[PDB]
Amino acid sequence: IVPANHFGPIPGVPVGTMWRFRVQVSESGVHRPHVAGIHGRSNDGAYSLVLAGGYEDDVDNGNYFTYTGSGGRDLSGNKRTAGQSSDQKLTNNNRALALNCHSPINEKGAEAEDWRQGKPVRVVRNMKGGKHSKYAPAEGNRYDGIYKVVKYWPERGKSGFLVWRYLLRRDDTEPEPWTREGKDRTRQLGLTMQYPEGYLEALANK
DNA sequence: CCATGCGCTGAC
DNA sequence: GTCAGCGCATGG
Numbered sequence A: 001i002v003p004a005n006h007f008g009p010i011p012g013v014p015v016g017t018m019w020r021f022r023v024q025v026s027e028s029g030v031h032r033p034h035v036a037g038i039h040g041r042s043n044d045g046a047y048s049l050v051l052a053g054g055y056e057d058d059v060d061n062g063n064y065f066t067y068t069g070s071g072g073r074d075l076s077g078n079k080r081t082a083g084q085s086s087d088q089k090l091t092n093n094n095r096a097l098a099l100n101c102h103s104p105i106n107e108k109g110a111e112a113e114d115w116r117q118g119k120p121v122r123v124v125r126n127m128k129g130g131k132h133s134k135y136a137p138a139e140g141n142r143y144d145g146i147y148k149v150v151k152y153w154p155e156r157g158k159s160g161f162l163v164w165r166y167l168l169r170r171d172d173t174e175p176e177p178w179t180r181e182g183k184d185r186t187r188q189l190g191l192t193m194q195y196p197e198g199y200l201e202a203l204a205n206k
Numbered sequence B: 001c002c003a004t005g006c007g008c009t010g011a012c
Numbered sequence C: 001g002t003c004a005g006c007g008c009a010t011g012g
Helices: A022-028 A092-099 A127-131 A180-188 A199-205
Strands: A038-041 A045-051 A059-061 A064-068 A121-126 A141-156 A162-170
Touching (some): A022 A141, A092 A162, A121 A127
Parallel strands (some): A045 A121
Antiparallel strands (some): A059 A064, A141 A162
């Protein structure tokens, strides 16, 4: 298996692979955190991210998307998500993702000199993003391939609070799973939704 | 030890 | 559709 700080595609996991739950995506190594949208280390970079419609400032255009950093929220009361109530900061996961950009870390944001030389990020799209994106899968989670950070910057989001934004652009030879070519490949590879052991059983009875 | 957290399940 | 809160993994 690969280390937790592995950059790039996970061997044996082609674009198009699908998992019903986040813990399954974690177990595969594609996106380790089972909750966080970003998996990264503040002195290395981000290895992967998940688009799940969790942040109102995200803009999903398929091969291109504007991702929002995490944080800027009050999670007291043992919460995992909430609306924006404070300015986000270029720290922890947010800092890791900015490091993927082919440019020195910049507190005011930056643009890549040559975006193709930036560190790769494995991208997963979750069905919940389907509320505003036509690229989200109908069910579960789907690995969509490698993307790179073209630029990142801070600005006031819909809430009026400062949020960090990142422009990601796809850089993968495997076809996008939402195109005719991607669907054909998924079919040819016989990829199907992965469910936990005995999940469907208990699911039906519910 | 402690902060973070783009989930998930059940009760309206 | 809202919404309250819990275990756990990862990073530091």
